[PDB]
Design a protein around this nucleic acid. Structure first.
Lengths: 213, 54
RNA sequence: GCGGAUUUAGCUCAGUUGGGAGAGCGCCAGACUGAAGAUCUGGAGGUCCUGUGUUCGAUCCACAGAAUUCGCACC
RNA sequence: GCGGAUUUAGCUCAGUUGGGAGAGCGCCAGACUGAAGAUCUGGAGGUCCUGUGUUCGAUCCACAGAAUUCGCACCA
RNA sequence: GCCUGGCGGCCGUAGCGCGGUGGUCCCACCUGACCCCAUGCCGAACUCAGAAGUGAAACGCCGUAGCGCCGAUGGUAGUGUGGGGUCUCCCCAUGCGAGAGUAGGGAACUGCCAGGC
RNA sequence: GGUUCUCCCCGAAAGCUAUUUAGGUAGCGCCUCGUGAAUUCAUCUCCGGGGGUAGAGCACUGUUUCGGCAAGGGGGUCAUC
RNA sequence: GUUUAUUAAAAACACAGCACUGUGCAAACACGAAAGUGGACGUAUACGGUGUGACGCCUGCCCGGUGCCGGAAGGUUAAUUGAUGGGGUUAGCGCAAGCGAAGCUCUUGAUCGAAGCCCCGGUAAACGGCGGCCGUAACUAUAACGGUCCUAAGGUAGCGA
RNA sequence: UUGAGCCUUGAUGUGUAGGAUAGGUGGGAGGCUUUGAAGUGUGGACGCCAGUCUGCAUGGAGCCGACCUUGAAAUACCACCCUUUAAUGUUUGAUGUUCUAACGUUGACCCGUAAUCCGGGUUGCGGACAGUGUCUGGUGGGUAGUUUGACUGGGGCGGUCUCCUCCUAAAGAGUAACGGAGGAGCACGAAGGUUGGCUAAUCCUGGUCGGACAUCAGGAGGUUAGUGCAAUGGCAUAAGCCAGCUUGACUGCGAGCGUGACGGCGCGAGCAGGUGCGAAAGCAGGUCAUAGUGAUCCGGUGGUUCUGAAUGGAAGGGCCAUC
């Protein structure tokens, strides 16, 4: 195995202190970090694993969206972190600043299939750091699929030595371990290579933890 | 088991019901060459990796 | 009697998956010698015991026979 | 078979910047010889042990496998 | 009595030869056919269709002593059940018989159910 | 190695299986003494056919030999073995 | 000679030299549980190994195997000494399933590692040891002369039962 | 001198482009701001030039960064990570190198002593040496031990109980001989199945690539056939065969019994389920079978609802894998 849930709960209990959670201004986040050993270019050990958290925290995930007119008034109630119409992509051609912006300060980009401009313009400034869109369903009754991507993280390594993602906030380490172990089941099912681990930590707004395993 | 060109035991757990057995295959000829559908719970013939995984 | 070895190039015997038949050496040419050998490069030299079978292919094995030969069986 | 190592010319073996893949002894041959050995110098020389995956490009990086091999397990 | 079809009783008189006749009935060939089915190639072998045509045959009989095969009455092996004998086990007083051999023997037999002179 | 007074009927003790066996060993009896019991068990008269002790053939493979030729094979000779 | 009285009556061999060997010395031997008494009232020319076969010469020769031991250039892989990995007993962490830190420990053949010996080297008294078939002298055939075989190897330092 | 941890002190880097000296690995979009706290401008001095030192500006101006430009790859701001190794501190093992109150005095001097034992000190000597307790090693026949089957036309050899066949040997059953022929120490990645399919040759005659031969169409229609090691025997509605479709060789019990001596070794009415095999009738414990191991006692090992001297967990047992 990678690890199990008591191993992580027992380390999260420490990551959320005044010693480790060195606070600036607001309610900050917690992170799972996992580092490998024999990892090279072959293919056996590449991920993506889009993991919609078991127990969503105090701070939700930063989802843009792109609807069509009929399902648009559902999605308008449904708390997307921003919206642009399937239409108004026509107007965004050559707007470098917005493109780089949106790729900088959102995390997910859910599109009705009619949006076929978003495939072209946005790649160049999203891909080198590695975050992604998906084809949204076309229906009116759409909330829980917005909420899906408003709660979800990606297991990013296509070629690099280590994987590290947001997993919770300051309030409760126990529900937050149940978040971390769902990431770890998705990994061990994809990259069946186990002893190629270097280390497994957790981490904050800054300082990391040397988890008991 | 004692020799080399000899008939050997390969430890054989089922695909669904845990239960394991053994008897006879051979290191004389190429080894990549079996799996099977039988069931020691008898309920449904489905899957059996043998001792061997083909 | 049984069980082994052996009948493979002048000499000495190597070799066998079971598809090629070997070299130390003697001859032959080649040239160096008038010549010959050394040494030399080239080339060659065969009852591969016979019979039957197994086999893709038996010099080889298995089996029947022949023959040289050895250890023991005998006191 | 537990873990490292190696396999690159006939045999010992370089191969570590991933961009030309080769040296040594020997073999061939010429020069030389009176003919060989020697000495000099050209030529010859491959399942890069296997096959992929990754790469613009793979002996090379990685994985799985076989053999050679070193130490090794053991009170069915 | 005569002829056919189907299925038995039949473990070899329950095996061949030479021929000579038979049918739009029985089979069947034969001549079509992607098929059903697919020859790991062919309908040759089962088939599916049945037109058109005759018995090449398939299949049956009738004549038949070429070749297997059949066989009395009797004699005999040799021997249990005995008594006596007695170079290599005989000869009687009995239980009964394969073969040598001779008269002499040939192409079997029998049924069930439908349909035809 | 030896039955230390009498008597009477059943009663071969003395072997089928072996045995890092050697007058040595596991159960055993065709045995009695006490329980339990049926046409139980056997020779015959018979029913029904596998045996193959005999015995007899030349069918088979293995073959005697005399006849008769079965492109088999020889002798004699022409010839280039 | 008188020495094995007991088969032989010596036809046994006790001499005695010496290369080599055990001791630089509380020596070699230990018998007695504590002796230091043989050797010692003494030194490696004192006393013991294994012998020797008068005397005197003469010990040629040849290291395959196999001994005698010695050594270290070097591998087989140990009491010595413990990389690590897997466990146990258990705090912490788990409504449960169960994870899981020290410490205490179990269990590694981590790694060095030659007694033997691969080996390296000296031994002639250590253990034994002299191959065959093919061809031959003005005759027999003597058996001097000969090619070879991966055989470890052909009667020799003598006098002829 | 040389080995184990450990940063207290150091340090192994120049190429273009980016007004500019770019280890990698990550987060996101901000970070510093009390005047004695920060840069930023510009002088001056050391030189293994890849370090820095030392003077003076100014300082709530807005300055570093996604935000505008560059590239082989970003940079502001917090995370992450210490080693191949040196100088020392602070933690500590070893081997050499020796001095030496251990020690032994079987060496003297002194000494109790007209003293061989023997008491004890100055001294002299070597020296952690000695002493043995087990562990690893062969080294020798320097105690003791044993004589380990039997088969014997009496022995030494050559044969067998094995577990097999045919011969020999008197039919239920058997009964050897240094006697006759010959022998298991094994066997499937299929020598696996249930429907289906039947007919193989020699030699005669033909015909691309010969020179006995290999798919054939035909003979005559012979029941003149093939057996991948050893062998006997199968026997043709073929098992040899061989293509499609694919690997059931069910979990569990059994009336009936074959019977035998504790193992055992054989098979089946019928009953449960559902377990697969086919339309159906219905059919069945896999290599042609013969030759293929444990008296069994001590072992070991792996899972449990079976337990365990007051319990609870739990040794060790029970069930049976696994040998």
């Amino acid at each position: 195995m990678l690890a199990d849930k008591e191993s992580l709960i027992e380390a999260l209990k420490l990551a959320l202190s005044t010693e480790y959670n060195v606070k600036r201004n607001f309610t900050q986040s917690v992170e799972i970090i996992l580092t490998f050993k024999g990892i090279d270019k072959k293919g056996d050990l590449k991920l993506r694993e889009i993991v919609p958290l078991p127990k969503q925290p105090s701070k939700a995930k930063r989802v843009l969206v792109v609807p069509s007119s009929e399902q648009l008034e559902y999605a308008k109630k449904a708390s997307p972190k921003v919206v642009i119409t399937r239409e108004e992509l026509q107007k965004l051609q050559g707007q470098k600043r917005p493109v780089k912006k949106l790729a900088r300060q959102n995390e997910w980009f859910l599109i009705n299939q009619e949006s076929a401009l978003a495939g072209r313009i946005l790649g160049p400034a999203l891909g080198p750091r590695g975050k992604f869109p998906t084809p949204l369903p076309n229906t009116a009754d759409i909330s829980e699929y917005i909420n899906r991507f408003k709660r979800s993280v990606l297991v990013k390594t296509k070629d690099q030595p280590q994987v590290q993602v947001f997993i919770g906030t300051e309030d409760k380490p126990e529900d937050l371990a149940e978040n971390a172990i769902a990431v770890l089941n998705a990994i061990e099912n994809k990259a069946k290579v186990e002893t190629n681990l270097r280390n497994i930590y957790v981490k904050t707004t800054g300082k990391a933890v040397k988890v008991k395993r | 088991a004692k020799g080399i060109r000899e008939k050997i035991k390969l430890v054989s757990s089922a695909g669904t019901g845990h239960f394991y057995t053994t008897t006879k295959n051979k290191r004389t000829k190429p080894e990549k060459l079996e799996l099977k559908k039988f069931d020691p719970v008898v309920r449904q013939h489905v899957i059996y990796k043998e001792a061997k995984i083909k």
